[PDB]
Amino acid sequence: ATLKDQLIYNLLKEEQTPQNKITVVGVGAVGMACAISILMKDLADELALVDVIEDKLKGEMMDLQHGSLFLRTPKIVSGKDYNVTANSKLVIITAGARQQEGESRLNLVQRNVNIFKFIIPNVVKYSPNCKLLIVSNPVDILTYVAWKISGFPKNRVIGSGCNLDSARFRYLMGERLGVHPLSCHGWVLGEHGDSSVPVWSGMNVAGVSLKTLHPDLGTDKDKEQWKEVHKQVVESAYEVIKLKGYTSWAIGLSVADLAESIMKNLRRVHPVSTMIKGLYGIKDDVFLSVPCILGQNGISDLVKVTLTSEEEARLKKSADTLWGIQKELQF
Amino acid sequence: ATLKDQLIYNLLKEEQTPQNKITVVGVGAVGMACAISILMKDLADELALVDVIEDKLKGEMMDLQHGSLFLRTPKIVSGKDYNVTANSKLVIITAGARQQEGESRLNLVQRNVNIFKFIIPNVVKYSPNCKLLIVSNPVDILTYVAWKISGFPKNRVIGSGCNLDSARFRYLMGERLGVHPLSCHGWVLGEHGDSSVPVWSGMNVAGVSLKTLHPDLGTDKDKEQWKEVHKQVVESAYEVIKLKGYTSWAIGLSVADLAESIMKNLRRVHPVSTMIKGLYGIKDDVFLSVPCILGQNGISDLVKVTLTSEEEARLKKSADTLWGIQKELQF
Amino acid sequence: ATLKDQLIYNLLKEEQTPQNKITVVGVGAVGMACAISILMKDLADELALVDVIEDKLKGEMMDLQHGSLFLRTPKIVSGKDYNVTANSKLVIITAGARQQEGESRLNLVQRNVNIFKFIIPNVVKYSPNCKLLIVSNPVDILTYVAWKISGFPKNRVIGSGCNLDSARFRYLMGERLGVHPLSCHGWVLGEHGDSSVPVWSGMNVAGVSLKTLHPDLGTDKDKEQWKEVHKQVVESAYEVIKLKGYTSWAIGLSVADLAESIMKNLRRVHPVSTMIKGLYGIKDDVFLSVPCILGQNGISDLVKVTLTSEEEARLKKSADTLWGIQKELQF
Amino acid sequence: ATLKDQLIYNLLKEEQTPQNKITVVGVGAVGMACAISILMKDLADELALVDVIEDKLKGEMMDLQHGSLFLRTPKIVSGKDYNVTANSKLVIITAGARQQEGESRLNLVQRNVNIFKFIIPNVVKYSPNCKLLIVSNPVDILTYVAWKISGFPKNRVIGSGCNLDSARFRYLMGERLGVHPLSCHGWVLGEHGDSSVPVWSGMNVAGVSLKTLHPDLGTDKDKEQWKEVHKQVVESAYEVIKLKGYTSWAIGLSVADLAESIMKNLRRVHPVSTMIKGLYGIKDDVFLSVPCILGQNGISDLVKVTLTSEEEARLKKSADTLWGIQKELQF
Ligand SMILES: NC(=O)c1ccc[n+]([C@@H]2O[C@H](COP(=O)([O-])OP(=O)(O)OC[C@H]3O[C@@H](n4cnc5c(N)ncnc54)[C@H](O)[C@@H]3O)[C@@H](O)[C@H]2O)c1
């Protein structure tokens, strides 16, 4: 007999389908940061990685596998073929090269819609009941694209949206007040990135509205310029790219937080991109961030935030812009 | 009054010392994986990052700070100046560029000795009571260098040594047996990397010695080629470099495990590099991996492993080689 | 030589002063639930237990020590003598038998002031720089007693106060809305227990004020009876005592959450009992719950919550009642 | 319209089922310590509690529910009816009053067999695919009883067995050597409690056999009395009962560790009670502890420990005694 058979007596071989499997598509800076965060939070019993660069993909898989002794995820797999992703509860899309210098949004949309045409049918083929979590940019457009190609119901297509924007805002608010970000509440909604909307009415510490205490909050005439907090969210994003060339840790940590609510059915509220048709005068098939309840069926509910006329106008303008790009797309 | 003063009443403004501070020196692939693993394990109340590339350093600091909402480390600081590292309990050295394309594994000696000449006195200036954890290669030589320059007692200079080698070995053992690496015990000692020693006598599952069950274990006569498990440790290290260009995740996870035992005073046993003079016929000031008890004073004790004649001869050969290089170094 | 000396070579026998020590005084239902919660959250490197019943104390210590394999707190000590508590960062008081049936508040305070007269000087003698966290009831009165006897500055004397009341409120709110309590914000302030104040203005989900949406919120004329969410906090407390005889798990978990902010210097905001003199027209030396910023120096700051005239009147009435009892105390 | 419908827009109201449910049967000292440990380890998405004392059951459920804000288990349910336990992955039996002073092993068996006659069919009815984890005493006899009544394959019927005995042994070993119990390996096998077997050959630190270093280990020729390390396991168990009246924390922590390997499919090796028929000359349907690989299918494999003739004779004697009691049982 072999050493294995001499040491171990087998009662059964009968392997089951993975019970809490997560797949990450695209093992770049963002994808690997999502992967390490997910592993360190014990969210999955199986992690699958997919990319088109075979050597980098294998090397990343091996490097994570070599840390198994310090993890509680007994199976890490990878491949260019989507058969490695079979029976995933959650599939995270972080694919396509990051935006290049001088590269426009329309050019990013062009190439990423193209790869989604291959990615999404392959994901759906092997995990037809998965929740799709889109991170790739422009995240609001690509969440619509994933929804359209997949044919999945609204609840199972989630865009990262304004989750990173709100996390950055809460960090900046915390720094300003000398309070941990967990205790500094504030929501950044609408279109992810440059055109996002800070909801000044909800900015609070311990339920004490900062807008009620300081009526000039968020206005350009504010003597203390609290609008700086939202402006620094956009500025810090560009600054990080200027200084290191990409963002990985902050987006990876924010994605693992969404994955935790989904995998553990927590029903916590997060700012994520969802189908907002029928809200704020929006009539088009567009995905924008609102506070969503996240659980085992993805987005089961959304919070109906009271917005000012200015805030509503900004979301409607974003919806018009996004729909303008979307109507010209070919699926 | 400002909005901050309107919202918050201050009881005292007494600036106090960090209680569980960790510094990481060199924010490359290894340093940042050490950082994210330490942050995700809640080991520090303050993290300080140091490097010579100012833009990359600032970008890395900001990226980690932007994930604060999902962490429990309230302060992340960085700087080229070592004043940012003041009062660290643990200082991790992951500095110096990794081994370049046509560079000798040894070419790191001269250039890393030169950078350590400036790093170590600066670390000692601001944290004279810290534990020093050396990761930079050749890790055994550089741990000796850190010890010599710092003037610290033996217990406060720890080399990552064979911690990654043993973690890889236990992953490979686990794969062969169908058992989690946590339950697959085995020790790889001596010189980190190519010249490491697998201690076949200690390889076990549930206290059942694999060598007792299979006497050919670790021999060239073994029809099952169990010796290939240690050889695959060395081969997988080269394979990861070939596939992705560097190793980050596995070393980061292993370093956070050592940091946990130190910060929490666990007194767990780890294979790390320590001053081995007085053991295995070694008379020179050389650092090699043996199982060490790690706690709040660093290495308080070491395990005296019974080695075979061939194992002892390999450690003594490594000591002769390391000392040969070390005696020619100028301080 | 002994087996220990044959197996292990000692580098240094020097033991450092405790670095992250917590003491729990009174190992009853509350004390032990605080103890298990602190241990499972890896908050301390040393846990000390104190009581007057020597056998129960030793049994509780041993029972925790027997679970050491599954914990990361390497030292668990106990004793009737407070020398075991030396150099604690945090001392938690859960001493005195729980309130008996037919026993009045005045009876409860008299008893507990009599034991605090011995406890507090003993705690101060061995840990003069500790933070004191009072749990024993009436918690607001006993926090004042601990502050008076200790002579500590007000930032280092923290009462559990309305932390459990707010946790219960958020659980009930979450059940009604179908949202996790983490995403259901609401503050219960003032006097702990029967006379606590729900601050309806701060009750929100994702920054959306429930009071703004539903102006009858918290009024008796409310068709949806949202006021019952606070009334059920008080009813649920009496119900738990009626059904099992005491509360342990919920208070244990809430105390560990306060211990986490203190030990890790998080600066999160919690509803805890602090010296309220100078706020809400209160002129007496009374401790009431307001949102406090908790860190390594205890309460460094407090949030100035805007209260309605009714809310302010209730806190002032509680201050008058508490002071009325406090002025007659003899210690 | 309601406040809930004003605040939250529902996307779907699909009444879904838990993916990772655990049930605890018997909410006594052991049962509730298992529950709190399981909750603090984030192992379940739903926890069900069952008992026959309805008030105590409801009070325990409520007390856990009130701590929801500090947990990540969104649903805690209870009931006398087993419909609350439907589709549990793991069912833990901690039912039947603890053995009383002057109560014989036979009397404890008889009353617990009677209670299992009702419990086990009820558990099987609602969770036919669950893993059964028996804690109630005499644990080896009651694991056999559960297996007989359930009709489950032997991989899905696990007895707590020598898991607590080995945890206590490793604690005592760690105390003597000044090493954390995680780094002190040693296995206590066979019959749980008084008649358990310490496997001296497997006792090691870092793969260094204590028996090889100290040949008198486990004998009376031992001037250091290492045999007491096993004897003190039995003595400390009686001592804890003498001092506090029961054991809860250590058994609770040990059970949560088994639950973690099962729920997360870790395939770690644990000393648990399994059907040992066909091993060590044993021919009867008896359950004894050996090192078992634990995962999503329960016990998939067992480690074949090489025992000395004396060790083998002690296990066969335990099997004869257990079978002697079992053959007279009425189902
Ligand atoms: N939503 C947010 O808040 C947010 C924040 C930061 C970054 N991002 C986005 O995340 C995306 C990734 O960023 P990055 O820095 O990791 O880029 P990257 O260039 O480092 O990595 C991209 C990876 O995708 C892979 N890839 C390319 N085509 C593929 C395909 N057809 N199938 C599978 N994999 C493929 C690449 O090989 C590469 O490994 C970008 O779109 C970026 O804008 C989003």
Ligand SMILES: NC(=O)c1ccc[n+]([C@@H]2O[C@H](COP(=O)([O-])OP(=O)(O)OC[C@H]3O[C@@H](n4cnc5c(N)ncnc54)[C@H](O)[C@@H]3O)[C@@H](O)[C@H]2O)c1
């Ligand atoms: N001990 C082990 O098991 C193990 C395993 C893997 C890698 N390593 C070692 O870790 C080291 C780092 O590897 P890497 O891949 O992260 O290299 P890297 O090139 O990615 O990063 C090196 C960093 O050090 C910085 N640096 C250079 N000089 C400095 C100075 N004087 N002060 C502070 N910082 C300075 C660089 O700017 C750079 O950011 C290497 O020596 C490598 O061999 C050790």
Ligand SMILES: NC(=O)c1ccc[n+]([C@@H]2O[C@H](COP(=O)([O-])OP(=O)(O)OC[C@H]3O[C@@H](n4cnc5c(N)ncnc54)[C@H](O)[C@@H]3O)[C@@H](O)[C@H]2O)c1
């Ligand atoms: N602040 C809150 O929200 C909150 C919630 C629940 C309970 N509590 C309070 O916690 C306290 C303890 O409750 P319990 O149910 O654990 O009581 P308990 O009767 O179970 O235990 C009390 C313990 O205190 C010990 N003790 C008595 N005198 C002592 C002394 N001089 N020194 C040290 N220890 C001594 C007892 O021996 C006993 O072990 C009560 O006052 C109770 O009201 C507070």
Ligand SMILES: NC(=O)c1ccc[n+]([C@@H]2O[C@H](COP(=O)([O-])OP(=O)(O)OC[C@H]3O[C@@H](n4cnc5c(N)ncnc54)[C@H](O)[C@@H]3O)[C@@H](O)[C@H]2O)c1
């Ligand atoms: N395997 C081990 O290592 C180990 C260690 C310690 C204790 N134990 C055992 O755990 C068991 C429980 O101990 P305890 O101290 O918690 O006892 P306990 O008296 O505190 O609690 C027993 C509980 O079981 C309930 N119960 C009784 N009949 C029931 C039924 N038909 N259905 C459901 N629930 C029922 C009781 O109402 C009670 O709540 C004992 O058998 C004890 O010996 C085992």
Ligand SMILES: O=C1O[C@@](c2ccsc2)(c2cccc(Nc3ccc(F)cc3)c2)CC(O)=C1Sc1ccccc1Cl
């Ligand atoms: O933080 C990021 O990194 C990216 C970024 C940053 C500024 S605009 C987009 C990112 C990530 C990686 C690469 C690039 N390349 C890039 C950036 C700007 C250019 F003008 C051209 C190319 C960009 C991608 C992205 O969406 C974010 S989050 C973000 C971006 C803008 C404002 C607010 C937020 Cl919260």
Ligand SMILES: O=C1O[C@@](c2ccsc2)(c2cccc(Nc3ccc(F)cc3)c2)CC(O)=C1Sc1ccccc1Cl
């Ligand atoms: O796993 C690694 O990555 C490095 C490595 C890998 C193989 S030799 C050294 C590493 C890290 C980063 C860069 C490079 N560059 C490199 C490597 C080999 C060459 F021949 C030339 C250049 C190397 C550095 C290192 O020490 C390790 S751990 C390791 C190395 C060899 C055998 C066993 C182990 Cl456990």
Ligand SMILES: O=C1O[C@@](c2ccsc2)(c2cccc(Nc3ccc(F)cc3)c2)CC(O)=C1Sc1ccccc1Cl
């Ligand atoms: O939840 C508890 O348990 C206690 C309690 C519960 C209702 S009044 C006091 C508690 C704990 C232990 C024992 C007793 N004994 C008792 C209870 C009621 C009586 F009328 C007489 C004696 C009481 C002690 C206490 O402070 C709390 S928390 C609490 C209490 C009232 C309202 C709201 C909350 Cl959040």
Ligand SMILES: O=C1O[C@@](c2ccsc2)(c2cccc(Nc3ccc(F)cc3)c2)CC(O)=C1Sc1ccccc1Cl
């Ligand atoms: O640690 C325990 O507590 C119990 C125990 C302790 C000593 S014998 C049984 C236990 C738990 C709760 C109550 C009682 N009551 C009891 C105790 C002794 C008697 F003689 C009669 C009744 C017993 C139940 C039990 O199995 C254990 S573990 C254990 C028991 C004996 C030897 C070694 C171990 Cl590791």
